[PDB]
């Protein structure tokens, strides 16, 4: 896009999905994928272990810790809308797909 690198990802549900999670706002680390199901709704959705979960089911993870993600992902809808930052070089990146949203 233009505004930013908003990587939309809508996996077919309900759960399970096939993707894992790692880190958390509480552990001072971004919620990334630990592993992706080879040949399934997970991988078939262009999922890969390393992406940054900016928002879960259309809900930013500003105040959602790892433990919360488990209760926010399972209670998702027929389809999980995970917004990735699509920043492979997310090692020393000074910025990152913002993707704001009024309330």
PDB file of C-alpha atoms in Angstrom:
ATOM      1  CA  UNK A   1       0.000   0.000   0.000  1.00  0.00           C
ATOM      2  CA  UNK A   2       0.956   3.640   0.498  1.00  0.00           C
ATOM      3  CA  UNK A   3       0.139   4.541   4.102  1.00  0.00           C
ATOM      4  CA  UNK A   4       2.097   1.554   5.377  1.00  0.00           C
ATOM      5  CA  UNK A   5       2.854  -2.158   5.123  1.00  0.00           C
ATOM      6  CA  UNK A   6      -0.494  -3.510   6.319  1.00  0.00           C
ATOM      7  CA  UNK A   7      -0.338  -7.253   5.734  1.00  0.00           C
ATOM      8  CA  UNK A   8      -3.906  -8.531   5.948  1.00  0.00           C
ATOM      9  CA  UNK A   9      -4.376 -12.193   6.864  1.00  0.00           C
ATOM     10  CA  UNK A  10      -7.796 -13.824   7.189  1.00  0.00           C
ATOM     11  CA  UNK A  11      -7.579 -17.498   8.146  1.00  0.00           C
ATOM     12  CA  UNK A  12     -10.641 -19.761   7.759  1.00  0.00           C
ATOM     13  CA  UNK A  13     -12.126 -20.811  11.086  1.00  0.00           C
ATOM     14  CA  UNK A  14     -13.271 -21.547  13.544  1.00  0.00           C
ATOM     15  CA  UNK A  15     -10.159 -22.802  15.332  1.00  0.00           C
ATOM     16  CA  UNK A  16      -7.876 -24.437  15.435  1.00  0.00           C
ATOM     17  CA  UNK A  17      -6.049 -22.341  12.842  1.00  0.00           C
ATOM     18  CA  UNK A  18      -2.649 -23.999  12.577  1.00  0.00           C
ATOM     19  CA  UNK A  19      -0.426 -21.064  13.502  1.00  0.00           C
ATOM     20  CA  UNK A  20       1.573 -20.603  16.705  1.00  0.00           C
ATOM     21  CA  UNK A  21       2.478 -17.569  18.813  1.00  0.00           C
ATOM     22  CA  UNK A  22       5.636 -16.350  20.548  1.00  0.00           C
ATOM     23  CA  UNK A  23       6.537 -13.378  22.723  1.00  0.00           C
ATOM     24  CA  UNK A  24       4.097 -10.812  24.063  1.00  0.00           C
ATOM     25  CA  UNK A  25       3.692  -7.204  25.167  1.00  0.00           C
ATOM     26  CA  UNK A  26       4.303  -8.439  28.711  1.00  0.00           C
ATOM     27  CA  UNK A  27       7.528 -10.266  27.855  1.00  0.00           C
ATOM     28  CA  UNK A  28       8.745  -7.103  26.125  1.00  0.00           C
ATOM     29  CA  UNK A  29       8.546  -8.933  22.797  1.00  0.00           C
ATOM     30  CA  UNK A  30       6.271  -8.814  19.722  1.00  0.00           C
ATOM     31  CA  UNK A  31       3.712 -11.581  19.209  1.00  0.00           C
ATOM     32  CA  UNK A  32       5.220 -13.587  16.350  1.00  0.00           C
ATOM     33  CA  UNK A  33       4.476 -17.030  14.920  1.00  0.00           C
ATOM     34  CA  UNK A  34       6.428 -19.993  16.290  1.00  0.00           C
ATOM     35  CA  UNK A  35       5.449 -22.462  13.569  1.00  0.00           C
ATOM     36  CA  UNK A  36       3.091 -22.802  10.605  1.00  0.00           C
ATOM     37  CA  UNK A  37       1.095 -25.884   9.611  1.00  0.00           C
ATOM     38  CA  UNK A  38       2.618 -27.281   6.390  1.00  0.00           C
ATOM     39  CA  UNK A  39      -0.131 -27.630   3.803  1.00  0.00           C
ATOM     40  CA  UNK A  40      -3.189 -26.241   5.571  1.00  0.00           C
ATOM     41  CA  UNK A  41      -5.293 -23.153   6.286  1.00  0.00           C
ATOM     42  CA  UNK A  42      -2.192 -21.823   8.039  1.00  0.00           C
ATOM     43  CA  UNK A  43       0.552 -22.108   5.421  1.00  0.00           C
ATOM     44  CA  UNK A  44      -2.015 -21.874   2.625  1.00  0.00           C
ATOM     45  CA  UNK A  45      -2.746 -18.423   4.047  1.00  0.00           C
ATOM     46  CA  UNK A  46       0.809 -17.258   3.354  1.00  0.00           C
ATOM     47  CA  UNK A  47       1.694 -17.694   7.028  1.00  0.00           C
ATOM     48  CA  UNK A  48       5.301 -17.958   8.207  1.00  0.00           C
ATOM     49  CA  UNK A  49       7.119 -18.216  11.565  1.00  0.00           C
ATOM     50  CA  UNK A  50       8.543 -14.749  12.128  1.00  0.00           C
ATOM     51  CA  UNK A  51       5.765 -12.316  11.245  1.00  0.00           C
ATOM     52  CA  UNK A  52       4.712  -9.697  13.793  1.00  0.00           C
ATOM     53  CA  UNK A  53       1.124  -9.796  15.046  1.00  0.00           C
ATOM     54  CA  UNK A  54       0.206  -6.106  15.011  1.00  0.00           C
ATOM     55  CA  UNK A  55      -3.458  -6.793  15.766  1.00  0.00           C
ATOM     56  CA  UNK A  56      -5.565  -9.878  16.476  1.00  0.00           C
ATOM     57  CA  UNK A  57      -8.996 -10.377  14.912  1.00  0.00           C
ATOM     58  CA  UNK A  58      -8.945  -6.698  13.998  1.00  0.00           C
ATOM     59  CA  UNK A  59      -7.846  -5.739  17.503  1.00  0.00           C
ATOM     60  CA  UNK A  60      -4.395  -4.298  18.130  1.00  0.00           C
ATOM     61  CA  UNK A  61      -2.297  -6.005  20.793  1.00  0.00           C
ATOM     62  CA  UNK A  62      -1.389  -2.800  22.626  1.00  0.00           C
ATOM     63  CA  UNK A  63      -2.693  -4.183  25.922  1.00  0.00           C
ATOM     64  CA  UNK A  64      -2.950  -7.860  24.980  1.00  0.00           C
ATOM     65  CA  UNK A  65      -0.292 -10.061  26.580  1.00  0.00           C
ATOM     66  CA  UNK A  66       0.690 -13.547  25.415  1.00  0.00           C
ATOM     67  CA  UNK A  67      -1.737 -15.093  27.902  1.00  0.00           C
ATOM     68  CA  UNK A  68      -4.469 -12.767  26.638  1.00  0.00           C
ATOM     69  CA  UNK A  69      -3.799 -13.670  23.005  1.00  0.00           C
ATOM     70  CA  UNK A  70      -4.846 -17.226  23.856  1.00  0.00           C
ATOM     71  CA  UNK A  71      -8.199 -15.925  25.094  1.00  0.00           C
ATOM     72  CA  UNK A  72      -8.449 -13.423  22.240  1.00  0.00           C
ATOM     73  CA  UNK A  73      -7.587 -15.894  19.479  1.00  0.00           C
ATOM     74  CA  UNK A  74      -9.789 -18.758  20.666  1.00  0.00           C
ATOM     75  CA  UNK A  75     -12.732 -16.395  21.138  1.00  0.00           C
ATOM     76  CA  UNK A  76     -12.222 -15.158  17.578  1.00  0.00           C
ATOM     77  CA  UNK A  77     -14.848 -15.286  14.829  1.00  0.00           C
ATOM     78  CA  UNK A  78     -15.474 -17.761  12.009  1.00  0.00           C
ATOM     79  CA  UNK A  79     -12.360 -16.136  10.551  1.00  0.00           C
ATOM     80  CA  UNK A  80      -9.276 -14.769  12.308  1.00  0.00           C
ATOM     81  CA  UNK A  81      -8.044 -11.442  10.933  1.00  0.00           C
ATOM     82  CA  UNK A  82      -4.370 -11.158  11.878  1.00  0.00           C
ATOM     83  CA  UNK A  83      -2.618  -7.974  10.754  1.00  0.00           C
ATOM     84  CA  UNK A  84       1.080  -8.639  10.169  1.00  0.00           C
ATOM     85  CA  UNK A  85       3.815  -6.032   9.734  1.00  0.00           C
ATOM     86  CA  UNK A  86       5.313  -7.926   6.797  1.00  0.00           C
ATOM     87  CA  UNK A  87       8.751  -6.765   7.937  1.00  0.00           C
ATOM     88  CA  UNK A  88      11.151  -9.636   7.252  1.00  0.00           C
ATOM     89  CA  UNK A  89      14.022  -7.399   8.357  1.00  0.00           C
ATOM     90  CA  UNK A  90      12.244  -6.817  11.669  1.00  0.00           C
ATOM     91  CA  UNK A  91      15.597  -6.988  13.459  1.00  0.00           C
ATOM     92  CA  UNK A  92      16.732  -3.376  13.817  1.00  0.00           C
ATOM     93  CA  UNK A  93      13.828  -1.590  12.132  1.00  0.00           C
ATOM     94  CA  UNK A  94      13.279   1.879  13.654  1.00  0.00           C
ATOM     95  CA  UNK A  95       9.687   1.913  12.404  1.00  0.00           C
ATOM     96  CA  UNK A  96       6.890  -0.563  11.687  1.00  0.00           C
ATOM     97  CA  UNK A  97       3.506  -0.719   9.956  1.00  0.00           C
ATOM     98  CA  UNK A  98       1.453   1.570  12.193  1.00  0.00           C
ATOM     99  CA  UNK A  99      -2.048   0.819  10.949  1.00  0.00           C
ATOM    100  CA  UNK A 100      -4.098   3.220  13.098  1.00  0.00           C
ATOM    101  CA  UNK A 101      -7.830   2.975  13.793  1.00  0.00           C
ATOM    102  CA  UNK A 102     -10.259   5.476  15.313  1.00  0.00           C
ATOM    103  CA  UNK A 103     -12.553   4.420  18.141  1.00  0.00           C
TER     104      UNK A 103
END
